[PDB]
Amino acid sequence: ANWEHLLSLKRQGDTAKRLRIEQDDTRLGFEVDYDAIIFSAPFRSLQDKTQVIPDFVHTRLTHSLEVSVVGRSLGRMVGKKLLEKYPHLEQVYGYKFNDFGAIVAAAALAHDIGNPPFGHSGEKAIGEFFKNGYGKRYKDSLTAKEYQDLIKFEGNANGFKVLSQSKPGAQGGLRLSYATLGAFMKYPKESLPHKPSDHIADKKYGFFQSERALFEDVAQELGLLKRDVSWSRHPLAYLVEAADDICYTIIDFEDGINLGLIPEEYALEYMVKLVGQTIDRNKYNALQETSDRVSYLRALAIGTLINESVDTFMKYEEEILAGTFDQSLIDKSNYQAQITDIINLSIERIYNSREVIEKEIAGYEILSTLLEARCRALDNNDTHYNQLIQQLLAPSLYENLIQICAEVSTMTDGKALRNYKKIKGL
Amino acid sequence: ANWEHLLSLKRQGDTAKRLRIEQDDTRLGFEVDYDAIIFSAPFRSLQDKTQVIPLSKTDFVHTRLTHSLEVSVVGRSLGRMVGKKLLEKYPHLEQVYGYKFNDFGAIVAAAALAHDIGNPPFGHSGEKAIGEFFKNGYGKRYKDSLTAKEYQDLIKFEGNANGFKVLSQSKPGAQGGLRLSYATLGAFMKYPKESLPHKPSDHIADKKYGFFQSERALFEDVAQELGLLKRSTTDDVSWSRHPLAYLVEAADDICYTIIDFEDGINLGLIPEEYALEYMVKLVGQTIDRNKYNALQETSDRVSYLRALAIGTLINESVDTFMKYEEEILAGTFDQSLIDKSNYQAQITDIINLSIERIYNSREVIEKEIAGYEILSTLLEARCRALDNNDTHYNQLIQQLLAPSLYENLIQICAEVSTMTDGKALRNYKKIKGL
Ligand SMILES: [Mn+2]
Ligand SMILES: [Mn+2]
Incomplete structure (x- = not known):
């Protein structure tokens, strides 16, 4: 793989090459990507969507x-070190270290x-709707990969659809740089085969059948290494x-x-190695509020992990460029012991808290209900009831079903509740 | 002081003495007291009243x-347990008068x-809402038409004193309230004094007061029958517990x-990580740690700890009572039984942890703030209606809440205090439009 091709400024439908040395740096293609996301309706809808707790x-x-x-x-930071490793990127092609930060920032x-709403339970509620719910009726009218798209409905693949979806008057969706689309794709494979290896890149899939032709174009332009289609990240x-x-x-x-779910004493206990070399003890002891102490520890812990992650990337750079790196960067951390205890305590005290469990169980019903109304109106667009369902909720079969899943996923947590209540009369 | 008199079976209005030796043991007056409380409307209302944490579902x-x-x-x-040891110490009590150890359990059980x-609802904010209403609120008005003690009853309104009123209030067709045995009324009365003088010592019996001016004549009859020892020779009356x-x-x-x-x-207000640290001295010799470690639910581990610690404190309290029995009988004991505990420091640590984590939790604070407005509102509406019973609105307030001036104000306070948390909030909500 060549860094010159991985940093492609190509946008969908382009008929000509975009050279980095010819960009206006006030309107760098990579920085425009960030701005286009900020102003987009899908990004705005994250305002009213839940991370873990409602x-x-x-x-x-x-x-x-x-x-x-x-x-x-x-x-x-990685950009600065990549340019010094491969000086021709800056001296011949005109790349600057802030381009690398722009690509990661927009992808991130x-x-x-x-x-979808309700987080990762939401994804599972959608897949369950097609595996065992009303949606199972379509199994024999779908290909193996089309059905796998639905029963393993994947928010990452839905994000790729959201970013690139064409509609009348808007070909290419947000029309992000191919480099940014490349950096977004952490599972560059289709839904089947299911987990062909233990690599994190094979854990899920990154694009629906409906978007395969588009990612094939992205991967070709970027020069991603071929690894059923899949590419090295x-x-x-x-x-x-x-x-x-x-x-x-x-x-x-x-x-x-x-939130009071984790006693504060665990903070210093699990984070002391992560902050020990950089913490100002006098600052810490002077802070009077729990929230100020824990936010100080978090800033230090994050800075420690950023530094180590940069060093891990550069150490394994050629292995990543050859598609032979077998882990995530954080899998290689020297703080893996502490990261694990943190995650395990979060899972115990937050993810399995009663209120999170309750919301996730409720979201199953909310999403299963909205999906069934949509699919029933799709199957019988004739009845009076299904005509109203269409005015309320939606004013090829695979393409119809994947769009139904996509539209349900654009819904905020609140809006999913209200439309669900009306269907049931509450 | 004599145990024979302290164990009085008299009920209010008795014209003839009730000898213990002549009681039917299947209808023992002290055990009838317990049953009369179980079935009483005041006790039933406790079902819908918060103790500390607001109720939930x-x-x-x-x-x-x-x-x-x-x-x-x-x-x-x-x-x-104290009864058996008292009967062994004063065997004339059983052999002559006929008292049995279960008599003492029955008196304490009923008073408890x-x-x-x-x-009042909403805790001690309920009490201070009532007190402040008459100290500085609308209730200030009446100060000059009331004696210092009548007024003190209001500005320092006390649920213990309202409990005594509740237990003995005379109404048409029901003189003497529940008509509990005087022994039970004596065991109930932990502050046997009027509202004034205010805290005349550091003794726990002088921290508050135990009866309103409206009940003074009744407790005078009670203290006389029991033979309680005088603690005052002025017109401000007071007795040893x-x-x-x-x-x-x-x-x-x-x-x-x-x-x-x-x-x-x-409830998750206290981290479970603290349970053994705060209980270890109370339970250390009796806890079966293997059993504790085998229990798989938090609620089971902590109920085991609670049952061990309660057992520990019961035995110790029985021993403290008997070691100080003559001082207690002479009215010279100056503290509570628990103040003498060998676990005093651990008890204090548990109590402070609870104050920090429960009493100062947001929900308990929110409730006490809400209570102050709910009770002040209800007291204002009752008292305005009392002052101008002619207006249409005040006739409605009377129909909604209650269908001598002191006797009226003390009755309004007692009626507000015996409202459940819900009824008080509903009435508050309607007075305010919701
Ligand atoms: Mn994320
Ligand atoms: Mn109590």
């Missing part, structure tokens, strides 16, 4: 904003843009994933302490 | 009823069952100390 708790937007800030640091900002996708990993590990922990 | 929280049940079971056990029956009142108090101390902690752990 006081102050992170939403998907605040989470995605934090991931994109950590991603920008990761990208800037978009990384959860396709996730764009190197920058490891930094997006690292940023995301860092944020939800540390920030969910912080949230759980401030 | 998502979790079990102790109500005033469940708390009072637990205190009477702990008190019955204290009275039984009733000990919180007069408390009935010895069994020390056992009611200890049962109460034991239950809210250990059981508030238990509730705080089960």
Whole structure:
């Protein structure tokens, strides 16, 4: 793989090559990508979507904003070192270290843009609707991969659809740079085969059958290595994933302490190695509020993990470029012991808290209900009832079903509740 | 002081003495007292009243009823064990007069069952809402038409004193209220004094007062029959506590100390990580740690800890009572039984943890703030209606809430205090349009 091709400024439908040395740096293609996401309706809808808990708790937007800030640091630092490793990238082709930060930042900002309401239970509720719910009727009218798209409905693949979806008057969706689309794709494979290896890149899939032709174009332009289609990941996708990993590990922990779900004493206990070399003890002892102490620990822990993740990337750079790196960056951390205890305590005290369990069980019913109304109106567009269902909710069979799943996933948590209540009369 | 008189079976209005030796043991006056409380409307209303944590439907929280049940079971056990040792010390009590050890358990059980029956809703904010209403609120108006003690009853309104009123209030067709035995009324009365003088000492019996001016004549009859020792020779009357009142108090101390902690752990207000650190001295010699470690639910681990600690404190309290029995009988004991505990420091640590994690939790603070407005509102509407009973709105307030000036104000306070948490909030909500 060549870094010159991985940093493609191509946008969908382009008929001519876009050279980095010819860009107006006030309107750098990569930085425009960030701006286009910020102003888009799917990104705005993350305002009203839940990260884990439904006081102050992170939403998907605040989470995605934090991931994109950590991603920008990761990208800037790795970029600076990539340019010194391969000076021809700057001296011949005109790349600057802020381009790498721009690509990671925009990819990170978009990384959860396709996730449904109710988080990852929402994804499972949609897949369950097709595996065992009303949606099972379509199994024999779908290909294996079309049906696998639905029963393993994947927010990452839905995000790729959201970003690139064509409609009349808007070909190519947000029309992001191919480099940014590359850095977004952390599972560059279709739904089948299911987990062909133990690599994190094979854990899920990254695009629906409906988007396969589009990612084939992205991968061709980027020069991704071929690995049923799948490719070795764009190197920058490891930094997006690292940023995301860092944020939800540390920030969910912080949230759980401030919510009273995790006793505060665990904070220093699990984070002391992560902050020991950089913490100002006099500052820490002077801070009077739990929230101020835990936010200080979090800033230090995140900075420690950013630095290590940059070093892990550079150490394994050629292995990532050859598609032979077998782990995530955070899997290689020296703090893996502490990261594990943090995640396990978060799972115990937050993810399995009664209120989270209750919301996730309720979301199953809410999404199963909205999906069944949509599919029934699709099957019988004739009855009076199904004509009203269409005015209320939606004013090839595979393409109809994948669009039904996509539209349900654009719904905020609140809006999913209201439309569900009306269908049931509440 | 004499135990024969302290164990009086007299009921209010008795024209002839009731000898213990002539009682039917299947209808023992002290055990009839317990049953009369169980079936009384005031005790039933405790079912719908918060003890400390606001009630919910998502979790079990102790109500005033469940708390009072637990205190009477702990008190019955204290009275039984203290009774047997008292009958062994004064065997004339059984061999001549016919007292049995279960008599003492019955007196303490009944007084304990009733000990919180007069408390206003929403906790001690309820009491201070009532007090401040007459100190500086609308109630200030009446100060000059009231004696210093009548007024003190209002500005320092006390649920213990309202409990005594509740238990003995005379109404048409029902003179003497529940008509409990004087022994039970003596065990109930932990502050045997009027509202003034205010805290004349550091003794726990002088921290508050135990009866309103409207009940003074009744408690004078009670203290005379029991032979309680005088603690004042002025026109401000006061008496040494009935010895069994020390056992009611200890049962109460034991239950809210250990059981508030238990509730705080089960509700997640106190981290479970603290359970063994705070209980280890109370349970260390009797706990079966293998059994504790085999229990798989938090609520089971903490109920095991609670039952061990309560057992520990019951035995110790029985021993403390008997070691200080003559001082208590002479009215010279100056503290509570629990104050003398060898676990005093651990009890204090548990109580402070509960204050920090439960009483200062947001929900308990929110409730006390809400209570202050709900009760102040109800008191304002009752008292305005009392002053101008002619207006149409005040006739409605009378129909909604209540279908001598002091006797009216003390009755309004008693009626507001015996409202359940829900009825008070509903009436508040309607007075304010919701
Ligand atoms: Mn994320
Ligand atoms: Mn009590």
